[PDB]
Write a protein that binds this DNA or RNA. Sequence first.
DNA 1: CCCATACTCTT
DNA 2: AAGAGTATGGGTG
Lengths: 50, 1340, 51, 102, 455
Amino acid sequence: TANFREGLNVLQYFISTHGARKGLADTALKTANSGYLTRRLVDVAQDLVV
Amino acid sequence: VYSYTEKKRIRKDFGKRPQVLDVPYLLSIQLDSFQKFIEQDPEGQYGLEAAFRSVFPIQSYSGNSELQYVSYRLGEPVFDVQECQIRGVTYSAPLRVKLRLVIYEREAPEGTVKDIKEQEVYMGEIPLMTDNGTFVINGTERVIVSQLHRSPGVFFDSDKGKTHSSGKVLYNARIIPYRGSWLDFEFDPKDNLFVRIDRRRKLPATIILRALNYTTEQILDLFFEKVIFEIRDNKLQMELVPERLRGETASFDIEANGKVYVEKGRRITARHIRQLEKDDVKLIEVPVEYIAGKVVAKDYIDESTGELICAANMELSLDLLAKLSQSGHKRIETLFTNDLDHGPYISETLRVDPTNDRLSALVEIYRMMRPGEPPTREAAESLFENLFFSEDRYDLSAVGRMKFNRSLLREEIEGSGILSKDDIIDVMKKLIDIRNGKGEVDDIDHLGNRRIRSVGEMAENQFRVGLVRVERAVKERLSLGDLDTLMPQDMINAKPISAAVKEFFGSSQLSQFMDQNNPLSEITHKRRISALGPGGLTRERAGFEVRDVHPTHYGRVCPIETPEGPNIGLINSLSVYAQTNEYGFLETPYRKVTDGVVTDEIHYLSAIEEGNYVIAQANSNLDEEGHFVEDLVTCRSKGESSLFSRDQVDYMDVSTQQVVSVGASLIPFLEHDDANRALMGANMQRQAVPTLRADKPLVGTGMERAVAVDSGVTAVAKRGGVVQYVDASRIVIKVNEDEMYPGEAGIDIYNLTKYTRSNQNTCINQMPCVSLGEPVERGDVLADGPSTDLGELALGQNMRVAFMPWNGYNFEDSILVSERVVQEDRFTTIHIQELACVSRDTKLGPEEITADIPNVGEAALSKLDESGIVYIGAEVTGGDILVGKVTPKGETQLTPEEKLLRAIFGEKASDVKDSSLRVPNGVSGTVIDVQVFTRDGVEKDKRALEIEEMQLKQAKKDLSEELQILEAGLFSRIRAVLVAGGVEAEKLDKLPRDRWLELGLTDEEKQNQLEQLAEQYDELKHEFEKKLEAKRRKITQGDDLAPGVLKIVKVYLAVKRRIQPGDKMAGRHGNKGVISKINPIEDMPYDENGTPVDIVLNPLGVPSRMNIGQILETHLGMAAKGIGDKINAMLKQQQEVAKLREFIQRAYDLGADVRQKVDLSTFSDEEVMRLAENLRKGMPIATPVFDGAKEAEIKELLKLGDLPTSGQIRLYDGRTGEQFERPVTVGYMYMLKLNHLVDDKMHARSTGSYSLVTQQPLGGKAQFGGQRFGEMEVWALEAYGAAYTLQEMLTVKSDDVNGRTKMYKNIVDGNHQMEPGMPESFNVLLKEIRSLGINIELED
Amino acid sequence: ERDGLFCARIFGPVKDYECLCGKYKRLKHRGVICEKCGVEVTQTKVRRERM
Amino acid sequence: VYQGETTQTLQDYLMWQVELTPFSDTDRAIATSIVDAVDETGYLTVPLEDILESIGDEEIDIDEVEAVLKRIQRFDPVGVAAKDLRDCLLIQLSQFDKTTPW
Amino acid sequence: PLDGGRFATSDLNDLYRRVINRNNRLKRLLDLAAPDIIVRNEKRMLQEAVDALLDNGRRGRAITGSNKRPLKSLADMIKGKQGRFRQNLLGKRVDYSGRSVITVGPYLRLHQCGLPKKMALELFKPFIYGKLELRGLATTIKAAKKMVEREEAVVWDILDEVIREHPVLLNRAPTLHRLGIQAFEPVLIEGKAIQLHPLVCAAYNADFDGDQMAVHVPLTLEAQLEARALMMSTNNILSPANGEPIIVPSQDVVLGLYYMTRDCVNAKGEGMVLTGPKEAERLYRSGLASLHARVKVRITEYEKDANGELVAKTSLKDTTVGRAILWMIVPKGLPYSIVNQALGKKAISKMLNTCYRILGLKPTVIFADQIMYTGFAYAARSGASVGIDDMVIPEKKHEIISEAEAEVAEIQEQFQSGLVTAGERYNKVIDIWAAANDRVSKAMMDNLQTETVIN
DNA sequence: CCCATACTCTT
DNA sequence: AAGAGTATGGGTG
Ligand SMILES: [Mg+2]
Ligand SMILES: [Zn+2]
């Protein structure tokens, strides 16, 4: 029920850390998965020229 | 009451909640672990005692002799920590171990004691830990990181229906020992149990049961109960219990004892069961078809025929019932099974299991474990015995035994270290009970299942690993019978143990060079927890669930400070108050609540214990006697939080900083920052570089002193006293008389570290913070280390900052910096670099270090002394000579041309070739230190003698201080004795001290006392001469170097780096940026008084990042600077002390019921003036991370200093003088300089060296390499259509050997054209493919 | 060593236009097989392309 | 795996200077032969007759070889590819300014 | 080769040695008529050695060295992410390249970049050698080399001459969509950082908090013309993915343009009639009128005709001072209605797209540069800051929270009485809290967005 | 984690 | 005697 101007207590901050770390881990780990998709897309359509 | 160090400058505190438990020593986790490893233990439970007892005694096959361990001992180290760092050797102690070889006679009861020989042997060196929790390995400080691993015991888990497409879950159990073989039990989609040994081919689960001498009847009895059907001439009447009928539907009309409880087609209800229990139904009438599918348990044989009728665990039929009916077998035992529970999994697995004996199971186990070889009965038996039931190949440790007993609901805690039959039976029964929906699986990420392992335990494990190998060697060498002459010393070789210890302490994954950016870096490094390492996880096969924040992390692991990237969630920081059990589990302290009254009792609870209580938050109001003001308080109960009544509270938190780590507790207004930016700020705060002068934060949290003192970078008084001598390099303290030991001169000497290189090529320098003659007490700070200011951590500088856009120069996190910042050297840093020159020995003669290089001019040799080494204090640049060296080129045939050369020019120029050490290109600095290491037996040059003389002078002075004190005391005694009788007074004063020994008195004690005093004086002189000789011998000892190495010379260069655009700056709230422009002073915005700002930051970076702590910090820093300005104005115009102390008391009294009380009435005028002098640059302020200052308090402090309450003022443009249209937030922030300098980043290349194989440019700035043009860049060029750019990048720039030369020539000639060829890498590929036996070739 | 994995008689000279023993040493003897050591007199880069 | 790198010897430096010098084809061949004849101390190891024979063309006289050799001897370092000590010293002295005292 | 005279050994050489030793032993055993029980074992070991040499670890257990690390075979060199194909053939390291940290250059034009001159001296070295030898300053290659090493004063003028119209390629990793490599004209600067134009950062996904970039130099005439005609930043204005413009103002430029084109109810100089935009600028600079004052201004605007000619019309428009000032930047051919409003990011993007579709490419580049300059200048002039008092909390937050807590308490008591179940109570509590959050958000936003002024 | 292949129970 | 299904192994990140 608090905002950042008022300030959070220990329990609320501890609760928010779960979502913070989940988002950070997802961002760190999907980089290695998008590159595989773009590599496969380039491999399948390398030679198509007008 | 305040200490001397704190009373000089008191930091105002806005905290409101009293402290009940002080912050503990921050390095206990390392010190306690190593002390436990090293200390003598009467019991064999920890350390070297456990390792020695776990192997010894060692007995030979014959049994006629054995070796017995008695005790061990650690000798004194040869050198000190500082001496080891200077010389570059390991700081270690020798291990002396007492062994006893005992011999036994033959043909006698037991073993007759023929001969016992006891000898103390040398086992090797053991590295020691310093006072700060580090190890000096090869002269460099190192840290061993603790590991968070999986606890030994038994664990039950399941898959979430992922392995089977039907969405059916499969359960499993696993037994994890400390050392041994794994044992797994698992289910299959067919409800059959299976057993896996060390992750190998699956086996039926009854093989292990049959390997333990178990009959099928016994197995059925263990895993199933019995139901008795009796032939009573009424269609096999059965003995039945009503509860058995629950969960079933009536097959027919259920009537017993003349009462129809249930009818056919009607399910049995609970009321029917209760009626059956009330009537005590025992006899039933069922049809002969009731045993159509029932399973018989035991074996029944007809006594007449004498043959088996039905085998054990077989389904009966009507014909079998008839067969047993004619034989008159009135007892049939079936197995009570159902569908809701009591599954037949054991019986079905038994039916599927092929073996039905005790010997074939061992054969199958041996074949599975060791295929490809024929089986053997003895081999299989030995393998099975040594797999799980041998103390020398399997150990379920004390913690493993405790966890095993806890998981099975046992009562005892202690036990054996090996498995038994009953343990496996209990594990199987528990797994079956889980399968029948009568239990729960375990949580792997729960902190009660993860354990902490520190350096002492790892060292013990490695020592045992070496010890077992030494034991094997001893047993192999003990077969020969020579007990009449052999000794234990010749039996054991210390090479394997010492090699293993060195390997662990030097090249382990968890042993790293200590991070030495600042004291916070070291504190953070020593308190780090890792899930990686030997026996841990990998960053590519970890998973998301192990990287998450768990509820059990509360108060034990910081939920914020973790690296971002591949290692997120795998590297953690210990919380402030966290500890470990004796078993290695994290625990946190709480205050006990009794009858609604909060007491001062502190209990450390672990994760398992914590979940069974209702624990209140630390943000809970309390009365004066300890009563909750409200009636409903917020509490966590079972992994979740809610409101509870006042009488349901069990415990409360001890502090509001219990949840966070040391690094996160240093961020002010942390509760106003988003968690992502808090993580970024915590990570960036420990990579700041120290500057020329330290500056305290001026807005802190109260943890600065603890970090500064516990890091060990400062000089702390060991005993109280008075400063007798103070200097820029040494401090001498005269100890108080009540803290002195008998018969000593009470003085303490502190030698400060001056301009020393760190592990990150930075500067380590100490400066005194005490004056000549002032009192000190134990624990006071005598000298500040790097990034320390009067005993407080000082990582950055205070900067006057405005939040506004300025002509696009702070666009996208750019920073605009004033020129006055550069002119004041506020962010200038010192960097120290080391270079080495090695002179070896060749076959044609040895290399010589000399100043007589024949091919160089006189100017280049001007900076070298007579020994060929550069002077101290010389400014050198790229290509200058540091150490001159020549290499013997060797003898020749001396042809007439060579004879002419030798005759005309000389002989020195014809025998040696220059191999000097020179400054690398792009490097400069000042020579500040030179070290010379010489092999023992080689003559030293003059430079080494000068260094040794300088090193001897310091020790001589240190000894002279104590010698002078003692001799002054003794001569005072002599004068006191001599005056009493034959007093000369002035005449005695005229004579020198030495003449007093010649003067005598009568034959009374007036002469015996003088003789005793003279003897004591001579003894003192002899003792100090012996001390000086010992120090000289230690100093002059030679250096042991690598084979074929004669001398080593090390030169240290120092440079100063100034701030410039392209350098990275940051705050403590995750607000980083790069300098874009240095602005002249008259262009900066200024206020009504003409004062400009130092930094301009973009306000657009705040709202989206949600790091609001920086705005509040800016406002509070403005207020603190205003208070300091008032104090400075009062000091400038000399006023009375009364007004100063009145104003300072008013400033310290501000706040709403704060817990800090400062009273200046107990301060003297001198102390008040000193404090006021220290406060004239601003009053420092502390705000704890969840008990900080409110906005109203900040506004009150602003009002006290006569500043606008909004925190915003009017500014004027420096270039036009026009006022900006809106008020701007102006204040003070704490900025840091990060170790990302554009001097180390910029790199360019035209042409250079190439690889020998691929013929392509090298990589790295150190090799002057090129940039990589990878596949994505090629794709971008293909998408553009730039074919010529791509071809030029692929051939004439990388590996077209002729094309490179032709392109260079054409470019120089002014013709921009290329002639591409074939890359060399394609030729290499063709050759490599041909080497595989494949014919690949080019066509046409 | 002769007939080894780096033999100059099989793979080529270790110096430009020189044989192993040293009878022939300059460009005037290009394309000459020394009877003593058996090494050809040519460029040393042939060791990248001789199997 | 670190495969090692390439180093520049005296002959590599001399050939680099040859490639960027306005020579003709025959002059470049003669320069190649001369640089091949230079040893590690910077002295020529064969008489010019051997170089003329190694050129392999009968249309070329020894004076052209002498001119090419003189041009090469002014490369960096000065005095390289000298026939003997006297020639090397004379070449080095030729590059000094006239104001030298002796 | 290592210090101390140790040559060590390679994996391939070790495998070859093993094969040769086994082959020689087998030859000797075969020619000695050895018993078959031993020659069979020798043949098996020779087969294993050959298999290990060709592909270690494929069959059986891999042969390791002294470091408990399996040796590398021919197959290991051929294949993998560290093999020839992916490490040396599909990508490679190149010459004439550099890298360093990037800062922001606000004064630059769209086709220019800021290159440190210390980097440029190293990158363009052979060009400088040729130019020095071309004008008689140096007579030999060694003389030019020594002059460049000593860094005389004339070599800087030579360097300024040789980079006058020579493009360079800037690249930031990772490269995703071909806009991660672009071409720019260098401007020599002091320092060690590369200056980047603010309008291209979105294409690079770059920010100035520690990012680094690499720079490459085209050599031949074809490469230089490809850089100028295909990869130049003034050619890549539209996105190849969807056709929308990519050089769009953001942050400071948007804030400044939005601030200048706003109106206030009662501002200084309100309600006067001006002859044109220049009079409005004179009034603003003199301090006689506010930037937000509502006035009437005579505006002349041009419109394209049917055959493609511009026709001008002049009329009095009701506008503000700031909009009239901004109108002096718009090129001929656009309606005045395109600026007579408060401009956000979408409006500025639409204005740029309209200019591109109607007028062409070069006017769009000029317009974008002028927009960036004007936005930066007026954002600086505004003095916009951030303070703690700007975050206004609605006054009704506490009562909404209290009412939500009361509803939660009453439904909890109802659950205690047994009227409901667990899941229904949980969902109802969630719904209550969501409704309370929506109420608080609406109250806060309604309080924040309006202010009261005196007429 | 996903796909291809040898061995096992069913119509 | 075919045919559908399960345990094992290879290549990928
Ligand atoms: Mg960035
Ligand atoms: Zn030869």
